[PDB]
Design an enzyme around this catalytic site. Structure first.
Site, PDB file in Angstrom:
ATOM      1  N   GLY A   1      -5.536  -2.160   4.054  1.00 22.13           N
ATOM      2  CA  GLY A   1      -4.782  -3.369   3.722  1.00 22.13           C
ATOM      3  C   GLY A   1      -5.531  -4.669   3.963  1.00 22.13           C
ATOM      4  N   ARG A   2      -6.144  -4.812   5.150  1.00 25.71           N
ATOM      5  CA  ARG A   2      -6.919  -6.006   5.558  1.00 25.71           C
ATOM      6  C   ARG A   2      -8.301  -6.096   4.853  1.00 25.71           C
ATOM      7  NH1 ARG A   2      -5.671  -2.450   9.907  1.00 25.71           N
ATOM      8  NH2 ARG A   2      -7.549  -1.442  10.742  1.00 25.71           N
TER       9      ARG A   2
ATOM     10  N   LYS B   1       0.829  -1.221   0.000  1.00 26.74           N
ATOM     11  CA  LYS B   1       0.000   0.000   0.000  1.00 26.74           C
ATOM     12  C   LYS B   1       0.869   1.280   0.000  1.00 26.74           C
ATOM     13  CE  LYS B   1      -3.953   2.422   1.981  1.00 26.74           C
ATOM     14  NZ  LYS B   1      -5.081   2.449   2.949  1.00 26.74           N
TER      15      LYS B   1
ATOM     16  N   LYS C   1       8.144  -0.500  15.005  1.00 23.28           N
ATOM     17  CA  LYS C   1       8.859  -0.085  13.793  1.00 23.28           C
ATOM     18  C   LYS C   1       9.968   0.914  14.177  1.00 23.28           C
ATOM     19  CE  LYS C   1       4.875  -0.556  10.715  1.00 23.28           C
ATOM     20  NZ  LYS C   1       3.899   0.167   9.849  1.00 23.28           N
TER      21      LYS C   1
ATOM     22  N   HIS D   1      -8.142 -33.003  16.997  1.00 25.71           N
ATOM     23  CA  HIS D   1      -7.040 -33.822  17.517  1.00 25.71           C
ATOM     24  C   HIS D   1      -5.922 -32.921  17.967  1.00 25.71           C
ATOM     25  CE1 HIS D   1      -9.042 -37.290  15.627  1.00 25.71           C
ATOM     26  NE2 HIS D   1      -9.407 -36.354  14.743  1.00 25.71           N
TER      27      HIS D   1
ATOM     28  N   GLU E   1      -6.395  -6.707  13.901  1.00 31.96           N
ATOM     29  CA  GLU E   1      -5.813  -5.427  13.559  1.00 31.96           C
ATOM     30  C   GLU E   1      -6.904  -4.348  13.480  1.00 31.96           C
ATOM     31  OE1 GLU E   1      -3.367  -4.521   9.878  1.00 31.96           O
ATOM     32  OE2 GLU E   1      -1.797  -4.640  11.436  1.00 31.96           O
TER      33      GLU E   1
ATOM     34  N   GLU F   1      10.215  -4.832   5.415  1.00 28.17           N
ATOM     35  CA  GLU F   1      10.246  -6.236   4.953  1.00 28.17           C
ATOM     36  C   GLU F   1       9.989  -6.431   3.466  1.00 28.17           C
ATOM     37  OE1 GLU F   1       8.031  -6.576   9.059  1.00 28.17           O
ATOM     38  OE2 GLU F   1       8.306  -4.996   7.557  1.00 28.17           O
TER      39      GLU F   1
HETATM   40  O1  LIG Z   1       2.059  -0.900   3.141  1.00 29.53           O
HETATM   41  P1  LIG Z   1       1.910  -2.462   3.149  1.00 29.53           P
HETATM   42  O2  LIG Z   1       3.346  -3.023   2.688  1.00 29.53           O
HETATM   43  O3  LIG Z   1       0.863  -2.859   2.194  1.00 29.53           O
HETATM   44  O4  LIG Z   1       1.905  -3.346   4.449  1.00 29.53           O
HETATM   45  C1  LIG Z   1       1.047  -2.800   5.296  1.00 29.53           C
HETATM   46  C2  LIG Z   1       0.725  -4.012   6.161  1.00 29.53           C
HETATM   47  O5  LIG Z   1       1.334  -3.906   7.467  1.00 29.53           O
HETATM   48  C3  LIG Z   1       0.340  -3.331   8.382  1.00 29.53           C
HETATM   49  O6  LIG Z   1       0.589  -3.723   9.806  1.00 29.53           O
HETATM   50  C4  LIG Z   1       0.430  -1.802   8.283  1.00 29.53           C
HETATM   51  O7  LIG Z   1       1.789  -1.499   8.681  1.00 29.53           O
HETATM   52  C5  LIG Z   1      -1.034  -3.818   7.845  1.00 29.53           C
HETATM   53  O8  LIG Z   1      -2.096  -2.928   8.123  1.00 29.53           O
HETATM   54  C6  LIG Z   1      -0.778  -3.733   6.364  1.00 29.53           C
HETATM   55  O9  LIG Z   1      -1.545  -4.522   5.534  1.00 29.53           O
HETATM   56  O1  LIG Z   2      -2.553 -41.206  16.775  1.00 20.35           O
HETATM   57  P1  LIG Z   2      -4.093 -41.510  16.792  1.00 20.35           P
HETATM   58  O2  LIG Z   2      -4.451 -42.703  17.584  1.00 20.35           O
HETATM   59  O3  LIG Z   2      -4.665 -41.784  15.337  1.00 20.35           O
HETATM   60  O4  LIG Z   2      -4.858 -40.253  17.456  1.00 20.35           O
HETATM   61  C1  LIG Z   2      -4.453 -39.026  16.824  1.00 20.35           C
HETATM   62  C2  LIG Z   2      -4.769 -37.836  17.739  1.00 20.35           C
HETATM   63  O5  LIG Z   2      -6.107 -37.836  18.209  1.00 20.35           O
HETATM   64  C3  LIG Z   2      -6.106 -37.356  19.575  1.00 20.35           C
HETATM   65  O6  LIG Z   2      -7.034 -36.239  19.739  1.00 20.35           O
HETATM   66  C4  LIG Z   2      -6.511 -38.518  20.501  1.00 20.35           C
HETATM   67  O7  LIG Z   2      -7.903 -38.627  20.255  1.00 20.35           O
HETATM   68  C5  LIG Z   2      -4.628 -36.935  19.878  1.00 20.35           C
HETATM   69  O8  LIG Z   2      -4.177 -37.187  21.215  1.00 20.35           O
HETATM   70  C6  LIG Z   2      -3.935 -37.969  19.013  1.00 20.35           C
HETATM   71  O9  LIG Z   2      -2.609 -37.599  18.749  1.00 20.35           O
END
Ligand SMILES: O=P(O)(O)OC[C@H]1O[C@@](O)(CO)[C@@H](O)[C@@H]1O
Ligand SMILES: O=P(O)(O)OC[C@H]1O[C@@](O)(CO)[C@@H](O)[C@@H]1O
Lengths: 578, 577
Positions: free
Chosen positions: A292-293, A231, A539, A410, A379, A237
């Site tokens: 932005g959002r 924007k 920042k 799970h 945000e 970054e």
């Molecule tokens: O100017 P930009 O690069 O689009 O990034 C802004 C992004 O970072 C922000 O935290 C603003 O700094 C978000 O609102 C926004 O989308």
């Molecule tokens: O490894 P399983 O027996 O397929 O269970 C997978 C996941 O489901 C669970 O929510 C158990 O129900 C997690 O503890 C477990 O890692």
């Protein structure tokens, strides 16, 4: 000068919620009439609000609170182009981005003696031509071939919406369109994914060079189109990554004219795009009144998404956003789906102290939705000061999180069932993007997924009493003192969104539903959903550390003076040590 | 005897009330407090100084840990005592990473057998199998080297694995396969299309869209399928296991050849055999290994050794073990996982900070928080204490997060000005892919790291109305709008700064969190090892499954349905044309 917490309708909800805490969802869910009323219909979907800790009379009081805060007037002012972003003295016009060409004049919005819709459609027509040229091979690489890769450089609002839509839609595009699968055509295992118009789309967001490594992996500069999305066009970054990728492109592409063919930009800043070296034909602008959002419906999303999927698909996505925008603006509060979703959220947060929202889509292709809803909600609504510029202490935005269903079951549903109460927002579809069914199976894989969608909502609402646990122990024979561990208290709220299908139109309906919900909630909370002053301090401080790193690494001093606390000094010493 | 009534607990209620009146800005000027709250272990520092406590309050948190007999309880866990009281089971994930030279000295007897013999038996099996896949000794049905690995598993059966996979893949590609040196930047000529670069996919969801993602561009003939399930009954994993077998069967026609493309990881030897998997293709684990503590077992060690080599995975186990040893032996006042657990417990109980943001300033850690979410929330998201009494005090926080700096442009606005959310920042001194250009003020890694230090300070210190008013003499914003630029400060953070993310350090990081969660469960006086809360949804879904089968096929059955008024309306819409 008085806060929203002082309104007659707010004080009545405090009283009504106290009574609601004594009532069970089990009792409410056995009232057919309440269910028929709390299940709202739209053409493409149902919004089931019945597993919410309110009677229809309390919901009517929430609607009365929305009237007292003048929600309709405020939403209308936003759509009209009024300067509702009061701290930046700016319009909020993301809704203008999706107004169709036939409505360019009827739905005109005048900002500085100019219909903004003319700028909107000017850029959309530009995107349509450019994306068609990349997809038809009219606009080619420096080696005169068709582009195969797209690196999108952007952070936050400049990629989150885009990646949500990209991930959600890619398989619908590959399957129903490129592979011509009909709805409910099962076991499409012969589908081809290595073909024309299948673009390798990458999102370079983090400044961490590990993200550059992920973006460039197995990629040839000669096949790569680079879209710089920002924007401001100043973000530390995005700009370091934009410079890094240009140098990366320059490793193979040696002539500036050829390098120009591989770089495009999306910004509100024409000066900084030119200063970067992007051609005028290669800049797809957006406007300051697009947060932005709230930027996916602008060139931010429309440019990379039209390259990937075709403009026609993206036009249908805009149409979906627009229909939901129209519903948001025109529907009476009592039957306004985003408003009722905002009121429910506001009710749980304020009157029950439920300060979390779990976004749980029962669709793997929605794996990037929560990450987008996190920014859009947190945000926008993670604020401390009201619209009267008064510091406030009442609850603002909840903490948003979630993973697609059934994955989450799970992982953390253990806590959603027995730990802190966390209202859930479930999203499901009647159809799959990749239907699977085998003759020996009791159910289709999609139905297996969907058994959970319905069951989790019920399990949360109803629970299982100590008596029911004691009854089922006559056979299990667990040491009786351990039975308390198997109790499910119930009364854990959920909203169910059940759509027919996730097509480009429905994806737009889903996006605008959430954008509309957040806008409505900001006004219910009486805060500015449109600014982000809270990101500035970090920042400022990082620029100080940057200068310090440059001074330290280069064994020298500068005009900058540093006053780092005792902890920062110790860790910076370790960080800069060999 | 509940925790809230203990002498040391009541004392923390009093001390925390005084702490709320104190600023982090004042504490951060005390060099002695900083030197004490910055803990050091091997190649890492844990900075606890941006926490709302004085040395004296931290010493009271240590006194609370002594009163709950934390050391005794941790020791009972390591010794193999049945500390998972609701299932009458041992908790022995620490056994999984005990090295071969300690097989006898560190022996753990369960049913007249040293469990370490079973641990090393499976590890030696994984080592041979993974070496054979990597050397092309174990081949496909077309007698070629496997290229793809589809891991079928949900929850604990993939979350730890994918965290380690994503974290380590580029270190393996870059430093090992491409021979990059720490002193080298801009490794743009690195090759990623080579022999020991396996295409690893995670099939978790029962949603057929996840099957679509798993099989995309994949040839059955090049694909190895690993079915991972502790029980080998999980509705999702098993439907996916059957779906992928049918998918393999589209090209692979002989059962002996099909057997070459399927391997399993389970505790159930009957169910893996009845699935049709060969015994030499089953790499078992044990009941005393909780799913969310299972990456150090065949669950992670099998797919990760195929991808990266066993030797790398042995170094990862060694890292887990060194941190386990520190957890068990270090004095509370100097015990890193214990102090992390105490801090978390303090913020949650005494400040009502019911969230934890896991914020790694490393893109390669993009799958870490998804793992920490299960490890923490499924363990500690409890309602009943160890004395089997329903409790109403705070248990596990809501965990979330995204890698830094990504999160800064998503939800830090809220972390700074909305509800207070204690943050856990993780950083490294080095990159897996260092970048630096001569025209740049800083290296890309340094640019990333400016934020790591700055965010912690911004949160702790803030910016007053007066400081905002002072900088408005030049800015000239309408004075009534200045309140929007105020940062109250006193927002807590922990900083974890490691030297490098290598296989050893990744193990240190894993055990740090596993150890923290174990310590916190005992501080909270709950069972960190069960998961009774996931049962109700499974029971109810089976009812819906039967209903779907009866209605879609227009045929009655022995099943009787009692769906509420809302479920009935939505099921009718769901099943209509
Ligand atoms: O100017 P930009 O690069 O689009 O990034 C802004 C992004 O970072 C922000 O935290 C603003 O700094 C978000 O609102 C926004 O989308
Ligand atoms: O490894 P399983 O027996 O397929 O269970 C997978 C996941 O489901 C669970 O929510 C158990 O129900 C997690 O503890 C477990 O890692």
């Amino acid at each position: 000068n008085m806060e929203i917490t002082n309104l007659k309708s707010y004080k009545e909800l405090v009283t009504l919620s106290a009574e609601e805490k004594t009532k069970d969802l089990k009792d409410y869910l056995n009232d057919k009439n309440r269910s028929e009323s709390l299940i709202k219909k739209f053409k493409n979907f149902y919004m089931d609000l019945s597993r919410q800790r309110y009677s229809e009379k309390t919901l009517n009081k929430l609607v009365e609170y929305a009237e007292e805060v003048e929600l309709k007037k405020k939403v209308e002012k936003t759509f009209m182009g009024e300067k509702v972003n009061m701290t930046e003295n700016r319009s909020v016009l993301h809704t203008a981005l999706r107004i169709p060409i036939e409505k360019i004049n009827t739905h005109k919005i005048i900002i500085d003696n100019k219909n903004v819709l003319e700028d909107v459609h000017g850029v959309l027509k530009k995107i349509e031509k450019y994306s068609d040229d990349i997809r038809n091979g009219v606009i080619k690489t420096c080696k005169n071939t068709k582009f195969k890769n797209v690196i999108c450089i952007g952070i936050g609002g400049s990629y989150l919406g885009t990646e949500f839509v990209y991930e959600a839609m890619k398989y619908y595009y590959y399957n129903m369109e490129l592979n011509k699968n009909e709805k409910d055509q099962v076991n499409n295992f012969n589908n081809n994914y290595d073909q024309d118009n299948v673009f390798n789309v990458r999102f370079l967001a983090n400044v961490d060079p590990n993200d550059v490594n992920r973006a460039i992996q197995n990629l040839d500069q000669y096949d790569t189109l680079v879209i710089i999305i920002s924007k401001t066009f100043t973000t530390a970054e995005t700009m370091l990554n934009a410079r890094s990728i240009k140098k990366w492109l320059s490793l193979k592409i040696k002539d500036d004219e050829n390098l120009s063919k591989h770089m495009v930009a999306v910004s509100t800043n024409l000066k900084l795009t030119d200063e970067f070296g992007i051609s005028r034909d290669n800049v797809f602008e957006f406007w300051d009144w697009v947060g932005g959002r709230f930027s996916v419906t602008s060139s931010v999303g429309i440019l990379p998404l039209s390259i990937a999927f075709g403009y026609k698909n993206m036009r249908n996505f805009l149409n979906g956003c627009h229909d939901m925008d129209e519903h948001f603006l025109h529907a009476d509060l009592k039957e306004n789906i985003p408003v009722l979703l905002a009121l429910t959220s506001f009710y749980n947060s304020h009157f029950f102290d439920y300060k979390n929202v779990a976004i749980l889509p029962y669709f793997q292709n929605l794996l990037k939705f929560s990450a987008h809803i996190q920014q859009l909600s947190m945000e926008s609504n993670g604020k401390s000061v009201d619209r009267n510029n008064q510091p406030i202490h009442y609850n603002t935005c909840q903490v948003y999180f979630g993973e697609p269903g059934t994955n989450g079951q799970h992982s953390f549903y253990q806590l959603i069932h027995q730990g802190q109460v966390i209202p859930v927002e479930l999203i499901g579809f009647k159809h799959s993007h990749f239907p699977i069914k085998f003759d020996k199976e009791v159910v289709s894989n999609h139905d297996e997924l969907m058994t959970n969608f319905f069951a989790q909502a019920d399990a949360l609402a109803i629970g299982k009493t100590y008596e029911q646990v004691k009854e089922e122990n006559e056979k299990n024979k667990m040491s009786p003192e351990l039975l308390t561990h198997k109790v499910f208290n119930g009364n854990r709220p959920s909203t169910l969104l059940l759509f027919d299908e996730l097509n480009f139109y429905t994806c737009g309906l889903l996006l605008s539903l959430y954008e509309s919900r957040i806008v409505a909630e900001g006004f219910l909370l009486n805060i500015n959903s449109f600014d982000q002053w809270g990101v500035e301090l970090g920042k400022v401080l990082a620029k100080e550390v940057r200068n310090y790193f440059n001074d330290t690494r280069n064994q020298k001093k500068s005009d900058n003076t540093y006053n780092f606390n005792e902890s920062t000094k110790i860790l910076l010493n370790y960080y800069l040590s060999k």
